[PDB]
Design a protein around this nucleic acid. Structure first.
Ligand SMILES: Nc1ncnc2c1ncn2[C@@H]1O[C@H](COP(=O)(O)OP(=O)(O)NP(=O)(O)O)[C@@H](O)[C@H]1O
Ligand SMILES: Nc1ncnc2c1ncn2[C@@H]1O[C@H](COP(=O)(O)OP(=O)(O)NP(=O)(O)O)[C@@H](O)[C@H]1O
Ligand SMILES: [Mg+2]
Ligand SMILES: [Mg+2]
Ligand SMILES: [Mg+2]
Ligand SMILES: [Mg+2]
Ligand SMILES: [Mg+2]
Ligand SMILES: [Mg+2]
Ligand SMILES: [Mg+2]
Ligand SMILES: [Mg+2]
Ligand SMILES: [Mg+2]
Ligand SMILES: [Mg+2]
Ligand SMILES: [Mg+2]
Ligand SMILES: [Mg+2]
Ligand SMILES: [Mg+2]
Ligand SMILES: [Mg+2]
Ligand SMILES: [Mg+2]
Ligand SMILES: [Mg+2]
Ligand SMILES: [Mg+2]
Ligand SMILES: [Mg+2]
Ligand SMILES: [Mg+2]
Ligand SMILES: [Mg+2]
Ligand SMILES: [Mg+2]
Ligand SMILES: [Mg+2]
Ligand SMILES: [Mg+2]
Ligand SMILES: [Mg+2]
Ligand SMILES: [Mg+2]
Ligand SMILES: [Mg+2]
Ligand SMILES: [Mg+2]
Ligand SMILES: [Mg+2]
Ligand SMILES: [Mg+2]
Ligand SMILES: [Mg+2]
Ligand SMILES: [Mg+2]
Ligand SMILES: [Mg+2]
Ligand SMILES: [Mg+2]
Ligand SMILES: [Mg+2]
Ligand SMILES: [Mg+2]
Ligand SMILES: [Mg+2]
Ligand SMILES: [Mg+2]
Ligand SMILES: [Mg+2]
Ligand SMILES: [Mg+2]
Ligand SMILES: [Mg+2]
Ligand SMILES: [Mg+2]
Ligand SMILES: [Mg+2]
Ligand SMILES: [Mg+2]
Ligand SMILES: [Mg+2]
Ligand SMILES: [Mg+2]
Ligand SMILES: [Mg+2]
Ligand SMILES: [Mg+2]
Ligand SMILES: [Mg+2]
Ligand SMILES: [Mg+2]
Ligand SMILES: [Mg+2]
Ligand SMILES: [Mg+2]
Ligand SMILES: [Mg+2]
Ligand SMILES: [Mg+2]
Ligand SMILES: [Mg+2]
Ligand SMILES: [Mg+2]
Ligand SMILES: [Mg+2]
Ligand SMILES: [Mg+2]
Ligand SMILES: [Mg+2]
Ligand SMILES: [Mg+2]
Ligand SMILES: [Mg+2]
Ligand SMILES: [Zn+2]
Lengths: 48, 550
RNA sequence: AACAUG
RNA sequence: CGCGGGGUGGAGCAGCCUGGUAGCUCGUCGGGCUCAUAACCCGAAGGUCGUCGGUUCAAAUCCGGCCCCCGCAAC
RNA sequence: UCGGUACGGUUUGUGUAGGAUAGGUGGGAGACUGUGAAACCUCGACGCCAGUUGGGGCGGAGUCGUUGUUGAAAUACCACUCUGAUCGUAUUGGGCAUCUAACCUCGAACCCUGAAUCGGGUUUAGGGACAGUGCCUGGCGGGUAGUUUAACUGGGGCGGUUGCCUCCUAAAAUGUAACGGAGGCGCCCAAAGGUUCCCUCAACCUGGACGGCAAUCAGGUGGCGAGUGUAAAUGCACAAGGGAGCUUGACUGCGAGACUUACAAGUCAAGCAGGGACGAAAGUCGGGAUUAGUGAUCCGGCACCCCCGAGUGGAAGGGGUG
RNA sequence: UACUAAAAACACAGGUCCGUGCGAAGUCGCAAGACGAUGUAUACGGACUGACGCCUGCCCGGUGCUGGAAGGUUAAGAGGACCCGUUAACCCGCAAGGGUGAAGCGGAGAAUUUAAGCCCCAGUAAACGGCGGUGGUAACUAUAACCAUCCUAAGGUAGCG
RNA sequence: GGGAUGAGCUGUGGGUAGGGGUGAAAGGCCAAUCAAACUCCGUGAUAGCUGGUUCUCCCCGAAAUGCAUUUAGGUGCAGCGUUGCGUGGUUCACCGCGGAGGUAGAGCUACUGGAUGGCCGAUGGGUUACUGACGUCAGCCAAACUCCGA
RNA sequence: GCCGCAGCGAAAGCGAGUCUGAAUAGGGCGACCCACACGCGCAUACGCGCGUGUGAAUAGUGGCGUGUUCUGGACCCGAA
RNA sequence: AAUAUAUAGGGUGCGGGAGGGAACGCGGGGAAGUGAAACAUCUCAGUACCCGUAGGAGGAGAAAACAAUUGUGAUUCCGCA
């Protein structure tokens, strides 16, 4: 009920972060501003 | 070679799967019929094939240059016009590039003269791709076959259930090579389906229908695709061949699982009581109980709660008095010179084709209209309950519980204080399935939701308007054996001719011809009498239109 | 065609 | 000593695991039929779901710990 | 006899308006007397407008035709072919049947054979492309074969326990055993995380409609007796506890010095920079008041970095980071 | 049981069941062969029982054996959509490069077709096996011939103790 | 003591060979050896087990604990012995000085649990024989109680 | 031919340096001599930067001995 | 010969084979104890034992070979790698 999701950037689509969410609380894919190292600045990140 | 194909496709939430291991493939010209219960995934397979969603595993691969159409279970439109409803899709790669050919030829001379050779002739190239580009004389060809509304009026509340006749003309003009028509025969007539019968027969291209009618499934379809709840199984033959081999399959499956359930109980006590029996082997025999008990719970599905219509006040002796009513619009002549009482404790049926005015007649009774020259007496003991044809009380963003309860805790239904969450699961939403949005609900659970916010008053005068749509035979029988046990005045508009033969006591019906198009005949008795009274009083007791050049 | 006993 | 079932109306018992509603067979109280009792037919009454409370909008049910009832237990 | 492929002739299609677009595309004055008025008629196709000149058994004369012009097009006529139907040759595959010639015979007869119930050979009687055997392939298989079946235990067996977190035993640093005494864990939280700004609780006395020993109100005394997402211990009123606004540091690149420690692991960390959030700033943030919520190596899977590429170019595979 | 056990152990006569239509079945053999047998269902091998007299009750759920038109699941063989490596040519630009790619040859191959078995449906217990509880009731008590009920594939009959 | 004209006893020649024979069946018998014979060979099998290991002196000198173990009678690493090269009083004791504690003790109108006699008095019992709290003045107890404290 | 003669890196490689990194930030491993005088933008003083020698001390490889060890029966005897 | 072409078979004449040997060779079959601190893949080992069969030696051998933009030019055997 707590699966491990990975978070991919919007522009370069690299996979930089893995984390846990609750699936009966949040059905849709998360969005966070995290730090993409290949871009050098904070970008948006959905799930896969 | 294959129009459409699937790998190990599994569209699902990880808590609740809706497709699982769907491996099959289709040919060109594959007329398919899809059958199954509600809650299987019949519309979440036709949604992958038109690219409107993506699976969570497995590749869904259309062919190279074959385009696909779709008609969803609710048809969207645009709010512009009616002849706009034949240019958006369908003729959309010709019409948008039709005025531009008339725009590039406005005879500019200072701008460009010899650049009319690589763009105006290129637009001349694409008109030959369609083999016809006048587009006008062959567009009344597409609306004098569906019997469309007059093309110069917007699709506001002006359109009733012939909204579907327009959406069966955006789709059947594109002529896709894979045609995903999901329940086309909602809200249609005794002849609007009869047109669609002969049109889907001689149709070059594949066809997937999720229909329930019998002329398509017995004569047009060649493959039948059963959808079990997550599974998918193809079969070959028409629907008469399907149900015979389905019957002998569920025969030997009915005692496949009897001796399975007998086995689990015979070695239930072997693993629970008396664990003294064997040492250091017991962790190898205990797992064979769990490996058959975890597959005994993947077909344990028999939990189907009944549709129940609550009872409120005592209904008196007068319910609906219609005092020589006329109703119509500017130039239009619907209901004219009609007078009828409404029988206490009796199911009332309404008969008429699309465009006679059946659902406006209930809007008079609740109060959403006003009669032109007439009056309707309500009677101070009745209580209305109006479920609409267009299902307009569904707000497709907020969740299921918030549509029917308005965020409250107790709602007022049967002169009691019912806890409003318990009133939700009474129509089939167990627990954590309140929390999912109503715009994505199934065709059963959008018809098991419109009965929730409209039977919320316990009224002894309920006005059912298209109740027999998108629900299977387990609920359709559980409806008709639940509005017989209701103490008064259920009034039903329907088109399922094998529904009014079950549950009817009175019939209001249209009988108009070329003297006046707004007659309404009243009858005392069931549908198995009106079909015999009609042939002995009137004389009215084909020639198919092509929709294209050929 | 049902009908047992004080 | 310890292990593992079970408690649902006077008696025997379903309902659970896959939460919203308490039900069936005998019996008990009243009517009917008969000359009268059995049989049969119609209507009722009767339960804080063993108890002390944890989550939940909501627990007979999901959840443990205590109290009786039963089964099985030593070379 | 039933189906696939390949080729070939025939046949098939009806919105409305016109003598039912004879279906699409490309051409084109042609058909020659075949009247249609025999028949499975009306080409026997559809039998929906009830009719589309060809198995034509009065004929050799007259032929829907060119002319007529309603409609994107009516117009004869063959040729190329679309979704169907229907017959014909060729090829191949599946089923049953029949035949003899490969194989089968411990049916008989006659030879080598003088002595032969072996063997082989000849003729005959039957079985027959089955059987049997070979290569591959599933099923069955204690009929045989090699082996495993943990430890602790006041002697073994039956019960029970095995890792992680807190307390007591533990003798005022740390550590410390037993089948010693009490309890928890295999999560949960997208805010219950970060920040910035505010607030003081439980119980009680007096009084107050419903209102009760205790629901909310108002005033007094109240220094922590409540509360803490979870078990206990140490903390916490300065708040780490109650409430609100904006947000993602539940970060990428590193880390001097340490605690613990057989080793493998486990734990803390000022500070430096990239880039952010909060805040007027000072600064704070590398998840949760802290200590449980997990698992070494090998073999694999996925996304990226394009590092090596078995002569060379690539590729297969291997490699690095997650 | 030569060398601590001579019996209640084995055998036997008779009984029943299942196998076997004849170089049979079974057995020794990798095979040819041989025994069965110079026999042919009144014969021959396997199993339990054990003269003789009276008898041999109920259960086909479990697991074996026998017979089943189907239906579900299932190996190789057949089948080879789609995808991938390569490059004759064709693109754009810095001709240290990036994009599309017919044919031939390769790797990986999904749909579809296909047998016994297993599942399943029936018969068999002289096949391996199994053959129960609680509560109330009769002129003192005691006890229940009768009734209610649950569970079972069916609840221990004759005879004995 | 039992059979002693039978399923008897016996002589001579022959047959069946080791996961095989034969067995009126006991795991009995197959050259005094049988729950798988004997001989030779792989072979100097293997054994966390047992027994043995031979001349001398001089210096120094242990451990029976920790952690991990298909491990508890075994072993790896550390602890503790010896020795070579480096380091040089860093070790150890006593004195003075700077520090953390919650054991023995004791205390409880400082808390969480208990707990005994009076005054006091709600709920239960028979309109009040009994239940006597929360509180309140004195005396008590505590490994999982501590305002304290060697 | 082996071992020494230069190391870092997964490797292309670069080299008294190299890998990680966006970094002449920090680390990881590896190289790098004083007791002087003179010399020294000379500094209160104290040697850092750099010098000819005043000639700081590095050092490996191959034989034969000894202790332990690896593979072989491996200190010797012993099964069913 | 059956049975005709004829073979099977039979008479006569010349040659040749068989068995033995201590190790070495070539082709073929092929264990287990043991090591893995148990054990099955694995090892032990293509060893022990067996089978065909040589010769004074045998087998191998005159590129359908190797190498990498240079090049060595049949095989066996010992050293390095
Ligand atoms: N909002 C409107 N204003 C005016 N005329 C209307 C409107 N809606 C419908 N109409 C006309 O009324 C006719 C039928 O009305 P409608 O509301 O569709 O009832 P209905 O016949 O029951 N539809 P249906 O259930 O499909 O048969 C249509 O064909 C229109 O001509
Ligand atoms: N996005 C979704 N998320 C979760 N459940 C969904 C979603 N979409 C559909 N479902 C459910 O999954 C099942 C799929 O059914 P769906 O294909 O939506 O229509 P259907 O019921 O299968 N056919 P019909 O009954 O005619 O509507 C139904 O039970 C739906 O309620
Ligand atoms: Mg939320
Ligand atoms: Mg649907
Ligand atoms: Mg309507
Ligand atoms: Mg009588
Ligand atoms: Mg009565
Ligand atoms: Mg075969
Ligand atoms: Mg065995
Ligand atoms: Mg068996
Ligand atoms: Mg032990
Ligand atoms: Mg013991
Ligand atoms: Mg201590
Ligand atoms: Mg101490
Ligand atoms: Mg917050
Ligand atoms: Mg706070
Ligand atoms: Mg994390
Ligand atoms: Mg460090
Ligand atoms: Mg910091
Ligand atoms: Mg910063
Ligand atoms: Mg700022
Ligand atoms: Mg926590
Ligand atoms: Mg390993
Ligand atoms: Mg290469
Ligand atoms: Mg790769
Ligand atoms: Mg890194
Ligand atoms: Mg004896
Ligand atoms: Mg004897
Ligand atoms: Mg004796
Ligand atoms: Mg017999
Ligand atoms: Mg045989
Ligand atoms: Mg017989
Ligand atoms: Mg038998
Ligand atoms: Mg016996
Ligand atoms: Mg007997
Ligand atoms: Mg059976
Ligand atoms: Mg069978
Ligand atoms: Mg008896
Ligand atoms: Mg004698
Ligand atoms: Mg005698
Ligand atoms: Mg005698
Ligand atoms: Mg043996
Ligand atoms: Mg050896
Ligand atoms: Mg030894
Ligand atoms: Mg000494
Ligand atoms: Mg040691
Ligand atoms: Mg030492
Ligand atoms: Mg001191
Ligand atoms: Mg001191
Ligand atoms: Mg303490
Ligand atoms: Mg004390
Ligand atoms: Mg006290
Ligand atoms: Mg007291
Ligand atoms: Mg103390
Ligand atoms: Mg450095
Ligand atoms: Mg020597
Ligand atoms: Mg010889
Ligand atoms: Mg071995
Ligand atoms: Mg072994
Ligand atoms: Mg071993
Ligand atoms: Mg060993
Ligand atoms: Mg030679
Ligand atoms: Zn990015």
């Amino acid at each position: 009920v707590r699966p491990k999701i990975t978070l991919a950037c919007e522009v370069c689509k690299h996979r930089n972060y893995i984390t846990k969410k609750n699936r009966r609380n949040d059905p849709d894919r998360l969005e966070l501003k995290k730090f993409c190292p290949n871009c050098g600045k904070h970008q948006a990140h959905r799930e896969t | 070679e294959f129009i459409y194909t699937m790998k190990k496709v599994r569209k699902a939430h990880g808590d609740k799967v809706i497709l699982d291991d769907v491996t099959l493939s289709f040919y060109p010209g594959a007329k398919i019929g899809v059958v199954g219960p509600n809650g299987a995934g019949k519309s979440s397979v036709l949604r992958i094939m038109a690219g409107l969603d993506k699976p969570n595993n497995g590749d869904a691969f259309l062919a190279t240059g074959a385009t696909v159409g779709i008609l969803q279970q609710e048809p969207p439109l645009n709010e512009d016009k009616t002849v706009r409803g034949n240019v958006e899709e369908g003729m959309g790669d010709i019409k948008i590039k039709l005025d531009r050919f008339n725009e590039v030829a406005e005879l500019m001379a200072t701008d460009y003269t010899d650049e009319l050779m690589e763009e105006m002739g290129r637009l001349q190239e694409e008109l030959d791709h369609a083999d016809a580009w006048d587009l006008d004389a062959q567009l009344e060809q597409a609306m004098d076959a569906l019997r469309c509304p007059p093309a110069d009026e917007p699709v506001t509340n002006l359109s009733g259930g012939e909204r579907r006749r327009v959406a069966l003309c955006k789709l059947l003009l594109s002529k896709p090579d894979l045609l995903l028509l999901d329940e086309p025969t909602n809200h249609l007539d005794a002849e609007s389906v009869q047109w669609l019968e002969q049109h889907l027969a001689s149709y070059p291209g594949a066809i997937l229908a999720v229909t329930h009618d019998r002329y398509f499934l017995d004569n047009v379809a060649e493959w039948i695709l059963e959808l079990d709840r997550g599974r998918a199984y193809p079969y070959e033959g028409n629907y008469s061949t399907y149900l015979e081999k389905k019957a002998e399959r569920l025969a030997v499956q009915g005692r496949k699982d009897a001796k399975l359930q007998k086995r689990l109980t015979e070695e239930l006590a072997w693993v629970r009581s008396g664990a003294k029996a064997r040492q250091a082997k017991s962790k190898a025999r205990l797992q064979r109980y769990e490996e058959m008990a975890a597959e005994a719970e993947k077909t344990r599905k028999l939990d189907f709660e009944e549709i129940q219509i609550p009872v409120g006040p005592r209904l008196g002796n007068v319910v609906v008095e219609v005092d020589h009513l006329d109703k119509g619009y500017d130039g239009r002549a619907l209901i004219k010179d009609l007078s009828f009482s409404l029988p206490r404790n009796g199911i009332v049926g309404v008969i008429g084709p699309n465009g006679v005015g059946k659902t406006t007649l209930f809007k008079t009774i609740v109060g959403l209209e006003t009669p032109d020259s007439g009056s309707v007496k309500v009677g101070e003991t009745v209580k209305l309950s109006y479920v609409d044809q267009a299902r307009a009380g569904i707000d497709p963003r907020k969740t299921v519980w918030e549509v029917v309860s308005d965020g409250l805790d107790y709602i007022q239904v049967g002169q009691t204080e019912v806890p409003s969450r318990a009133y939700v699961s009474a129509f089939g939403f167990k627990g954590p399935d309140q929390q999912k949005p109503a715009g994505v609900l199934s065709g059963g659970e959008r018809n098991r939701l419109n009965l929730a916010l409209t039977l919320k008053q316990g009224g002894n005068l309920i006005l059912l308007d298209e109740p027999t749509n998108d629900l299977d035979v387990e609920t359709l029988g559980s409806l008709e054996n639940a509005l017989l046990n209701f103490p008064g005045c259920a009034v039903v508009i329907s088109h399922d001719r094998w529904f009014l033969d079950r549950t009817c006591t009175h019939i209001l019906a249209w009988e108009g011809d070329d003297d006046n198009e707004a007659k309404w005949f009243w009858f005392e008795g069931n549908f198995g009498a009106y079909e015999e009274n009609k042939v002995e009083r009137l004389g009215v007791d084909v020639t198919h239109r092509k929709l294209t050049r050929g």
